[PDB]
Amino acid sequence: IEEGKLVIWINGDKGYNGLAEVGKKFEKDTGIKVTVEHPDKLEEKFPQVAATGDGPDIIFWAHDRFGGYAQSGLLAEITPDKAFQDKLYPFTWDAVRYNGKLIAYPIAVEALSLIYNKDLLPNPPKTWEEIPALDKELKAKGKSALMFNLQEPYFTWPLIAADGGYAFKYENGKYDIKDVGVDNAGAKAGLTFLVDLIKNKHMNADTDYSIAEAAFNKGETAMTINGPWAWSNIDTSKVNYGVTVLPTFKGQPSKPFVGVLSAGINAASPNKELAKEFLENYLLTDEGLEAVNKDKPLGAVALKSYEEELAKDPRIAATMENAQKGEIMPNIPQMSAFWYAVRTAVINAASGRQTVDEALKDAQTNAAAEFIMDSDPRRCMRHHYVDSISHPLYKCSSKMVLLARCEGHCSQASRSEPLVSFSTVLKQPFRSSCHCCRPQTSKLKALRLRCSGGMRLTATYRYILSCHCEECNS
Amino acid sequence: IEEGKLVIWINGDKGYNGLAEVGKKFEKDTGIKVTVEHPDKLEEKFPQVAATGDGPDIIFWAHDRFGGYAQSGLLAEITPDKAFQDKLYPFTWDAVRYNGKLIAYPIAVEALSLIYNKDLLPNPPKTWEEIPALDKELKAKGKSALMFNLQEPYFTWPLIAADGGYAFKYENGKYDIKDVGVDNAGAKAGLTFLVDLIKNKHMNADTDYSIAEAAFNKGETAMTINGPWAWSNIDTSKVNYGVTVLPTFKGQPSKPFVGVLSAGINAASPNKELAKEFLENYLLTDEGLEAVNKDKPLGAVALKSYEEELAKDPRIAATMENAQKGEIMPNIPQMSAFWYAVRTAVINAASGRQTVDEALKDAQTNAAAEFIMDSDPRRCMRHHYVDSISHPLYKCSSKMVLLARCEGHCSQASRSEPLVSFSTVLKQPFRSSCHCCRPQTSKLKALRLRCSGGMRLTATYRYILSCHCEECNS
Numbered sequence A, B: 001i002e003e004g005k006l007v008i009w010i011n012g013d014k015g016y017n018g019l020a021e022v023g024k025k026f027e028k029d030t031g032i033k034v035t036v037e038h039p040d041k042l043e044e045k046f047p048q049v050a051a052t053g054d055g056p057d058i059i060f061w062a063h064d065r066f067g068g069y070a071q072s073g074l075l076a077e078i079t080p081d082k083a084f085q086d087k088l089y090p091f092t093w094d095a096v097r098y099n100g101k102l103i104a105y106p107i108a109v110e111a112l113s114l115i116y117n118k119d120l121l122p123n124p125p126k127t128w129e130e131i132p133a134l135d136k137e138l139k140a141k142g143k144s145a146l147m148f149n150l151q152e153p154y155f156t157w158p159l160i161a162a163d164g165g166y167a168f169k170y171e172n173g174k175y176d177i178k179d180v181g182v183d184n185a186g187a188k189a190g191l192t193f194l195v196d197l198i199k200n201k202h203m204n205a206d207t208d209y210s211i212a213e214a215a216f217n218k219g220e221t222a223m224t225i226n227g228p229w230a231w232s233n234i235d236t237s238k239v240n241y242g243v244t245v246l247p248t249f250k251g252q253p254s255k256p257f258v259g260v261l262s263a264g265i266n267a268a269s270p271n272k273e274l275a276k277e278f279l280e281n282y283l284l285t286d287e288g289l290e291a292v293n294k295d296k297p298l299g300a301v302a303l304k305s306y307e308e309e310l311a312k313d314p315r316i317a318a319t320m321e322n323a324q325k326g327e328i329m330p331n332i333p334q335m336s337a338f339w340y341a342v343r344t345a346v347i348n349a350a351s352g353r354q355t356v357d358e359a360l361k362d363a364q365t366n367a368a369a370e371f372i373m374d375s376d377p378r379r380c381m382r383h384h385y386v387d388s389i390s391h392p393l394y395k396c397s398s399k400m401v402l403l404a405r406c407e408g409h410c411s412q413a414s415r416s417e418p419l420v421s422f423s424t425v426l427k428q429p430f431r432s433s434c435h436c437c438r439p440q441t442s443k444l445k446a447l448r449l450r451c452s453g454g455m456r457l458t459a460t461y462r463y464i465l466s467c468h469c470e471e472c473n474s
C-alpha cells in the first residue's frame, strides 16, 4: 500500500464514479489522490490480498462480511467521536459493531424490492402465488412476468425465508451457529416454489444479474427484484417503473436479508488518518452522499440529515417497508459459510442437478461447518516491493528491481535469565530466547549499473525466498 | 505461579472451607494440591498481582469486576463445550460474556434480601417509610429496627436505585458510559432518606459488615440486609429468622444490583487445564456445589440440576424475587469507577462530611471518568523467582537465592531487508530490526558454596534490576 494516497474498493453495481467525485474534492483540499476500483469477486479478493498486508486502504461491502474480516484481523478499529456517532442511525452502527468494537462506517441500508413496469403491470401482484397465472398472460403478449438474478442467493433468500427459513437462529441478541434453518419445511416450500417456476417455464435457471437487468430495462419483463442501486438505469430506461413491497408467500411476507453498505479500513493501511478524514468529513456528509447517490442511488442512507431529505420518495419508503419485514444480516464469521452453502443449494436445485431438499440437506450441514480462515497479517511473512538500486556515491543509472523483505510479529515471548559461573572466565552472563522474523531461504542476485562515465559497477543483493521466526543469537 | 498445583482466591464472606473440601476430592483423584485463600481487598489485589504475571490460578468474584479484568488481559478465555454450556442457565453465561467471549464460569446468582427476626418482627415492613416509626417502638424495648453495612454501596444501592437511580443507562443491549444516574432526583431521594435515618438516630453512620451481623445475630436488631452467604450464621444463631422481599421506597421496589459469583482463570496460570477440570468436573456438579453450599450458602446456583433441588426454599425464592426487581450488574470496565464514586458519595453523605447531592454531584462525574488501567501482563517485564544454585559437577551445598528474569512480548514488528553492495567485501547481507525483552540494568552477585570436601567455590551471577525491549543485534 502506498503512503500518501487512498485506494478504495467498492462493488461494480454501486456508484463508483460518484465516489470518485468525492475523491476529487478530497484531492483538491488535501493533495491526496483517491483511486476507486471495482474488482470482481470483491468480497473474496479483499481477504486474499489483505491477509498478505496488501489491498485497498478502504473496502466497501455490505456489513455481513465484516465480522469475518475482523476476526482475521483485516480491519482497523474506527474511532468516531460521539458527535460523529450521533449523525448516524444507531441501528446502522449496530450492524458494524463486532465483539464490542466498531469495525466499519455504515453508509446505507439496502433491501430488495419488487421493481415493476407500470405499463405492463398497472397493478402488481401482492402474492407470489399469482405469478404463474400472470406469466401465463404476459407470454401471450410476447413478455414474461418476472426475471431476477437466480445465481446469487441474496435474491432468492427473501422467498426461502418467507415460510420460516432462517440463517442462524437469533435469540437473546445472539446467534447459535448450530441452529440453521435451511432445510426446514419453510425453506423447502420456498425453494421448491422457485424450482416450479422454472420447471413450468415461467423462469429460466441460467438467468443472472445482467440478463434480468437487460430484460426488465428493455421492457420484455413486467417485474424484477433488485436493490436501490439498479434504479438509476431504469429512469433513463424507456421504462415507466414502480418500486413496491415484495410479494407474500404462503400468506407471509418475503423476508429479504437487509445489508448495511459499509466502509472498513484495511489494518495494513499506512493511510488510516486519511481514510478517517475521507469517510467522516467527505463521504458521510449531505454532499458526499449526494455525489454517490447521483451516480447510483444508495437507498436509505445512514446519515440522518440526508435520509431526512430522501425520505419523501416512494422508492425509499418501499425499501424500508421491505427492510422492516426482512431481517438484518448477522455479521458473524460463519456467514461466509452460510452464503457458500445456500449458493450451491440454489444453483443445484434450479439447474436440476439435485432435488430441492437434497440440495438443502447438504446446505444445512455445510452452513454450520467450520471453514478455513484468512491467515492473520500480523504473522511473520514475506513482502514484495519494488525499489530502485543506486550507487551511494557515483552517479549511475538506477534500475527498478523487485525485492522481498520479512516482516511480522513472532508469537513466542522473548526472555532473558542469568547464568551462574565459577569459571573465572568470560561468558555471556544471560541465557536468552528471542524470535525474529528473518529470511529462511534466499538467493544471490547481481545487477549491472551504467555510470557516467567510470565505470560499470556490479551491485549484489540477496532476494528473499521465504521468512520464518528464528532465534536472535543464532 | 506453580505448575502442578491450584491456588484459588475467593472472598472471605463465602464458603471457602466448603470449596477446600472440593479441592480435597480433586487432590485425591489427581494428586494436585488445591489451596484456597481469602485475602482482603481481593477485587483490588488480583489485578495488582496478575498485572505482574502473579496471583492465583483461579479468582472468584461477582461478574461486575470481570469485564475490567478481561480488558487488561488478566483472564484466559474459557472453553466449555456445548454439553457443559447447557447444564447452566443461559442468563448466567450472559453475565460472563465479554466482547463476545466467555471469560469466567458462573456459579451462583446473588441478591440482597431483607433478613428479619421473626420474634421481634412477626410482620416485617413492606415499605421503607414505615421504618422510623418501627425503630421508634423497638428502641423502647432496647432494640433497633434495622442495621446493615453502610460502608459498601452495594448495600445502599438498592435504595438509591428505587426512585430512579441507575449506574449507566442501558438501552439496545448496551450501556452508555456517559449516561450516569447517580445525581438524578431519584438517587437524591434515595440517599437523602438514608441520611435522615442516620440524622434521626435510627441508624449509625459507622455501621459496617461485622457490626450489622453481630447486632442481628445477637438479636438486638429486628432486621438486616444481606445475601445468601450470611444465612448460615443465622441458623446456628439463636435467631428465628425470615428472608423476604426488600421494602419499597416512594412506592417503588428496591432495586438491588444482581451479581453472578464467578470463577475466572488467570491468564498467567500454567495450570489452565487443571483449573478447567476443577471447575467443570468438580465444583460445578451437584456435589461440588453442595460442599460449598454446606459451608456458606450460594443462593440461586447457576447449575440447573442443582438449582432444581434448592428451589423449594422460601429463602431462595426471596433471593430470586429480589433479583427480578433488581437489575444484573454490567460487567463493563467502567464499573470499577462507578463503584469507587458511589462508595465515596455514600460514606461522605452518611458521616456528614458532605451534603447529599454535593456528594452525588461529584460521584456523577467521577463515575464517568477515565480511570487508570491494569498494565497488560504480556508486556516486557521483570519476574522474581527463587532458584537453588548448584555446581554442575562437584557435590556442594546448594543455596536458595532470589533471582530475576526478563519476559514479555515486545510490540514492534521484527523485519529484515536486503542490503546492496558493490564492495566485493564481506558484509551482513540484511538490515534488520528485532526487539527482545532484555536486561536494561543489572548487578553482579557472588555466593560461597561449601563442597565436600574440596574446595569452597564462588559462583557469580547477575541480578537483573530492570528489563526493556532492545534491538537484537546491538
Ligand SMILES: OC[C@H]1O[C@H](O[C@H]2[C@H](O)[C@@H](O)[C@@H](O)O[C@@H]2CO)[C@H](O)[C@@H](O)[C@@H]1O
Pocket: A011, A013, A043, A061, A062, A063, A064, A065, A110, A152, A153, A154, A155, A259, A261, A339
Ligand atoms: O448472494 C449472496 C451475497 O449476498 C449479499 O451480497 C449483495 C450485497 O449485499 C449488495 O450490496 C449487492 O452488491 O448485491 C450482492 C448480491 O450479489 C451479501 O452481502 C454477500 O456477502 C453474499 O455473498
Ligand SMILES: OC[C@H]1O[C@H](O[C@H]2[C@H](O)[C@@H](O)[C@@H](O)O[C@@H]2CO)[C@H](O)[C@@H](O)[C@@H]1O
Pocket: B011, B013, B043, B061, B062, B063, B064, B065, B110, B152, B153, B154, B155, B259, B261, B339
Ligand atoms: O460495595 C461495592 C461492591 O459491590 C459488589 O460486591 C459485593 C459482592 O458482589 C458480593 O459477592 C459480596 O461479597 O459482597 C460485596 C459487597 O461488599 C461488587 O461485586 C463489587 O465489585 C463492588 O465493589
